[PDB]
Amino acid sequence: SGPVPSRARVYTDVNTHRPSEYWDYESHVVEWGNQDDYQLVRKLGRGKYSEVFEAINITNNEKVVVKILKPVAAAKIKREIKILENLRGGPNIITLADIVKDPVSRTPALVFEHVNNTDFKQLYQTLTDYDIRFYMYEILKALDYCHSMGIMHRDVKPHNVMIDHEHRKLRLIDWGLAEFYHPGQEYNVRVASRYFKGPELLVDYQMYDYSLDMWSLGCMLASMIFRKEPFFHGHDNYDQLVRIAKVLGTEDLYDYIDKYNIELDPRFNDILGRHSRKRWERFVHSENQHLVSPEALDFLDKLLRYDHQSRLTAREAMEHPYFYTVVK
Ligand SMILES: NC(=O)c1ccc(O)cc1
Numbered sequence: 240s241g242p243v244p245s246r247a248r249v250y251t252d253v254n255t256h257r258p259s260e261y262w263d264y265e266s267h268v269v270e271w272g273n274q275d276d277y278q279l280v281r282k283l284g285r286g287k288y289s290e291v292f293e294a295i296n297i298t299n300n301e302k303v304v305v306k307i308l309k310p311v312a313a314a315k316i317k318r319e320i321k322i323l324e325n326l327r328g329g330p331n332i333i334t335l336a337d338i339v340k341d342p343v344s345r346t347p348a349l350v351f352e353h354v355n356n357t358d359f360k361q362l363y364q365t366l367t368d369y370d371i372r373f374y375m376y377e378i379l380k381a382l383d384y385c386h387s388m389g390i391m392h393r394d395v396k397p398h399n400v401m402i403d404h405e406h407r408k409l410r411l412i413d414w415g416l417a418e419f420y421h422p423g424q425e426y427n428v429r430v431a432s433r434y435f436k437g438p439e440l441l442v443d444y445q446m447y448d449y450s451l452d453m454w455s456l457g458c459m460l461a462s463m464i465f466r467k468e469p470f471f472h473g474h475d476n477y478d479q480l481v482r483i484a485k486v487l488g489t490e491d492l493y494d495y496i497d498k499y500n501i502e503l504d505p506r507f508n509d510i511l512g513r514h515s516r517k518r519w520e521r522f523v524h525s526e527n528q529h530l531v532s533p534e535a536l537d538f539l540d541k542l543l544r545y546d547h548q549s550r551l552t553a554r555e556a557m558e559h560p561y562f563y564t565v566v567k
């Protein structure tokens with residue numbers, strides 16, 4: 240009869256109760272600013288959906304970041320704009336300062352606050368035990384905020400976390416894959432970067448929720464505490480699941496796919512094999528041992544679960560003994 244349905248265990252009906260104006264991004268009307276207020280300085284990067292530039296707001300002389308949307312992006316731009324406006328002011332959420340029409344591309348350009356020329360992947364393999372804990376807690380603030388607001392990020396990775404290490408300031412960026420959670424809705428599984436893709440995405444389970452971001456955060460943590468970039472290093476999306484299975488075991492994988500009445504892609508029969516769950520202590524060595532504690536291991540264990548429903552939520556994660564040492 241097909242897959243068994245699933246719902247988020249928290250913030251289930253936040254959008255259902257809200258006026259349509261909140262989540263119906265298609266019907267959102269954009270208030271355009273002055274493109275001439277911003278002077279492009281240097282290109283930072285280019286992807287499939289945008290080109291990001293460092294800029295100067297010539298009115299106040301402040302450094303800003305301009306994200307010029309590619310035309311590929313059509314009316315998915317609307318979703319990002321709405322999400323960024325809904326989440327503005329939220330803890331560690333990138334602040335959207337303006338929306339201008341780019342003269343060259345003839346597409347919207349999103350103007351953000353400038354954090355630093357530094358991402359989390361530039362720093363994260365170099366942090367102390369205390370800093371891992373500190374920055375993980377800052378990330379959780381952003382995640383609980385967007386989840387509480389009916390939004391799932393769907394692209395949590397070190398590259399999407401902008402840090403000003405000197406000022407101990409953090410921002411969750413690139414809401415281009417973000418979506419409104421609607422209970423019972425089937426979503427596109429082609430979201431997030433390969434190494435941070437949850438087992439739900441890899442086994443083609445479309446009724447996923449906020450807990451997807453929690454798996455992605457677990458991938459980040461594992462990578463930080465064990466000094467392994469990335470932690471689950473798949474050659475592609477199939478080998479990605481095999482890499483996970485080599486650590487968590489194939490038995491809990493079969494229990495997961497059984498519970499949700501999911502049919503695994505036949506391609507997995509030849510490559511998945513049989514694996515016992517590995518104890519987290521197996522990944523400990525003299526080079527990462529100062530970052531590993533029984534608290535770190537128990538916390539990681541409660542994020543990296545196949546069953547998306549059995550993962551800690553962002554709020555439960557903030558309550559964890561792992562964060563008791565972080566000054567609050
Ligand atoms: N697609 C995107 O929005 C994007 C922008 C900059 C990158 O460096 C990578 C990706």
Ligand SMILES: NC(=O)c1ccc(O)cc1
Pocket residue numbers: 291304306333351352353354355356357401412413
């Ligand atoms: N601080 C930065 O370099 C930065 C990068 C990308 C953003 O979308 C926002 C800010």
